[PDB]
Symmetry: D2
Subunit: 250 residues, 4 copies
């Protein structure tokens, strides 16, 4: 058995762990990211044993042309699309902090990548999943879809849209064999957050708000994705699986 | 006495009821909408008693220049901005239905008006509220911020972002004297929904999902906004006030 | 118009503020609490001007007999019951902390007052409101209905039940003219909690978790109750109105 | 390996699927239920292949003495308690419908089994889990913890308490190595529900409110429990995993 999974933001962090997990299970993966060079370096160092089973596609998820071509390339190469994991996401730069001082260009960029990218990915894959009569979509949202992360306004805003888009696809397509759920990770150690977590004071600060008193990992994010993408979640649809050491429970 | 409120989407529906209510209580209003012509007609038929206490400003909330100029005009005319009611919103045309068949242009327009417009409105008024040491923002979200409306994916997506943007401003600015909350209306009779609700068979399908078995009004939306904007809600911050006849409680 | 409101836990804190506000508005109030002596002293010092417009009734809300007698006495004296405010509640003693060390007796007591008491109150007033074809119920829940308060397990547990009971009544009776909503206060200064906040280090610790950087008051809880009990909230049903200075928004 | 799991309400429905699942994977189970005869009949027909690895304990979860003795017997027989699955639950009889016509005895029985039962089980196992420095608790709640089930007031009320108790345990004990989460199933076919589901009229009515247009199964509930109980959910704490075919997403 070998499902076809598309994973965005696949060259590092959560996306890399997710793509490797699908590969380790025997699935075929279309790994999409911004740099063809980085994708090849990732393939040589992390996906060496899978070589052929992973199709590396350069694509900016915020671009309709790139996304449509990536889905067309996936269909040409593997012949179906069973799972779509919309993982690509950005926080916005050092200036995308509180609302009033975040540059208009940064708000737009964060919304384009984090939300429009997910809309475009789903829009490109649904016709194929519909034809198949079955398909699974896992969106990587965040606890910021439920509570606001201080000093990260654009990001928080974008994640509220990710959660509702998730529920929208579930409601409109559950009757047609599609499953759509979101993982809502709390604080996870990745290249996106490493800058903050590397500073004792900031790390202590966020840990103070995590009852579990630990920072999550990309492997734990991949665990949740694999659960939502498989046979053990056939009745889970339109749901948010929060994986945050109880951060949102207080 | 008199507060200064900026109300977007003020020439009709909820926006009109909201603007008229602030005026009736003795406040001054900067009424922003897309058409100078319609704004004048509205001012003549609904706001004649208040004359100059209402500043009619043509503005597309999705446009940074229009919003910045509207805020500057409000400051010039009234001297402060005490309340911002981000009411303007669109559903998307008849093709903005389920996700896969919604025109990309429609998804971008709905996100631009419903979310970017709210970011731009808050980005422009916050600097002024901060210097005043007090400010209140009421965002008109929707129960679609909490559950998905079937066949209205872009709209549902945008409202998820509005609710989170609301919590973001509350979390980042509560300490500086700012209040930001959202009203989440269920089905309300307005120019935006009139077409559907006019048909008994369509109204009936909507009513079946409302335990109260009644369609809401613009007057009730205005009631919730006045509550959230005034002195009886000084400890309400970062909250969603759902007004849907129990639609979301089932 | 003079409405008849039954207010539980009326001799102190939120309940005292609520009863007082109904009286000041011209309504008649049946003030219920545990001690007739305390109620009379409360009546002499806070309700003097109203005299006969407030019926003081001794009642343990957890006791079916007391509740039924209190509703019968209200009908006899005033002839109708328009509003019921289920405010009475307890936190449990210093031993009702984390789950495993809370005495079974304390868990049972907290649940009986905070939950069974609300069930009994609603059960006793609903037949009358149904006959009147109109009635409003406001339950005083807590943000503990949505997130957990560390070291207050029984209390947190009880409030989850209050929130769902609220939703249950709204769904089953909204079509019959009944409205049922819940206020969910965050940290408020009242005798029930006014001992943790009293100690500088604790209050300070509490404030660090409230973005608005302030403790709420019973006057603000009364403000929310009045909104939910009246004419400005006719389409609000099955909702939880959070009043916490953005405590739950992060 | 070989964990020790306590599963309440283990003789039928979800509890039986959960119990069997732990056994099939090589874990040892203390199966608790109301009738020793039924547990033996079950041990005979469903667990015939594990004999010794499953300890049958008659116990009314609502009874502190029964619960304490059941935990004593599990420790004595197996030596530890690694997982507790609080599955036992009742809906109330035909008279436990809307709140006002719910016999007080039924409301009390539903709260004692569905809520006090969980408090007691958790109170009984937590000292041991803490001594071990590790432990996982999975509570079976319901979508009724989030929305109200029409005509099932006591049930709905109880499930709101279960969700918050879950968050309470997670928040107070996550730092001590304990995990506590809840599964919130939608409509599942079990002996507790077949009455309704069987009747064509009712099933259709139910299916109409489920976007996925299918009823859940005990096997799917066990799938969710195993996920929350194992190594793939080490960073999931204080969470509610909704499994309802999108029922709560609309
Ligand atoms: N780290 C955390 O605390 C945490 C918590 C919750 C969710 N997440 C999510 O994890 C996801 C993946 O990132 P990560 O942090 O796990 O590792 P990461 O940040 O190192 O990698 C993120 C990936 O997204 C890619 N990407 C960015 N914009 C893109 C675009 N327009 N098109 C295609 N690819 C693009 C980047 O190149 C990168 O490979 C993000 O969506 C993030 O929101 C992280
Ligand atoms: N009617 C409901 O059931 C309901 C429920 C929840 C929220 N709302 C919100 O109410 C708000 C107002 O609509 P309504 O239904 O009350 O009345 P309406 O739909 O008749 O009017 C909406 C107003 O928004 C204005 N507008 C649209 N785009 C704009 C832009 N780019 N810049 C400035 N103004 C713009 C329109 O011109 C119009 O005046 C919307 O945000 C809508 O989402 C309505
Ligand atoms: N103080 C806060 O921050 C806050 C926040 C949210 C909700 N509440 C709720 O307010 C309610 C009342 O307490 P408070 O803190 O507002 O004021 P308070 O604690 O000063 O007064 C509580 C009242 O409840 C009465 N009472 C207790 N048990 C009773 C019973 N069995 N029958 C009848 N009356 C009884 C007490 O005598 C007292 O008059 C409780 O339900 C509490 O959960 C308080
Ligand atoms: N059926 C559904 O759609 C659904 C959905 C969500 C949650 N649940 C929960 O599943 C649980 C069990 O019911 P089911 O439908 O899974 O299977 P079921 O109804 O066939 O079996 C329920 C079990 O609970 C046991 N039980 C009842 N009271 C008990 C007590 N006081 N002490 C010990 N055991 C007791 C019964 O004897 C029986 O073995 C309940 O808590 C129910 O709320 C069911
Ligand atoms: C919402 C959340 O968990 C934080 S997302 C922003 C992480 S960072 O870039 O500020 O380190
Ligand atoms: C109901 C609402 O606020 C917008 S979502 C439904 C749009 S329409 O189909 O009623 O035109
Ligand atoms: C604080 C509150 O709203 C009631 S629950 C906590 C009670 S105490 O521990 O502050 O006495
Ligand atoms: C159906 C369910 O999840 C529990 S609430 C309804 C119980 S019954 O009416 O199907 O017996």
């Amino acid at each position: 058995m070998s499902r076809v999974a598309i994973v965005t933001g696949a060259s590092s962090g959560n996306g890399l762990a997710i793509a490797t997990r699908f590969l380790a299970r025997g699935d075929r993966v279309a790994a999409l990211d911004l740099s063809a060079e980085t994708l090849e370096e990732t393939a040589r160092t992390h996906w060496h044993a899978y070589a052929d089973k992973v199709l590396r596609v350069r694509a900016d998820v915020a671009d309709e042309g790139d996304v449509n071509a990536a889905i067309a390339a996936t269909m040409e190469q593997f012949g179906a699309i069973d799972v779509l994991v919309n993982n690509a996401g950005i926080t916005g730069n050092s200036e995308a902090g509180v609302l009033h001082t975040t540059p208009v260009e940064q708000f737009d960029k964060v919304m384009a990548v984090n939300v429009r990218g997910i809309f475009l990915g789903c829009r490109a894959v649904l016709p194929h999943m519909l034809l198949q009569g079955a398909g699974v979509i896992v969106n990587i949202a965040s606890v910021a879809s439920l509570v606001a992360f201080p000093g990260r306004s654009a990001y928080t805003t974008s994640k509220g849209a990710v959660l509702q888009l998730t529920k929208s696809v579930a409601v409109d397509y559950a009757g047609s064999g599609i499953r759509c759920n979101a993982v809502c990770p709390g604080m996870i150690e990745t290249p996106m957050t490493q800058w903050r977590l590397d500073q004792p004071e900031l790390r202590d600060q966020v840990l103070a708000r995590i009852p579990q008193k630990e920072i999550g990992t990309a492997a734990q994010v991949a665990d949740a994705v694999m659960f939502l993408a498989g046979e053990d979640a056939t009745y889970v649809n339109g749901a948010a699986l929060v994986m945050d050491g109880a951060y949102t429970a207080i």
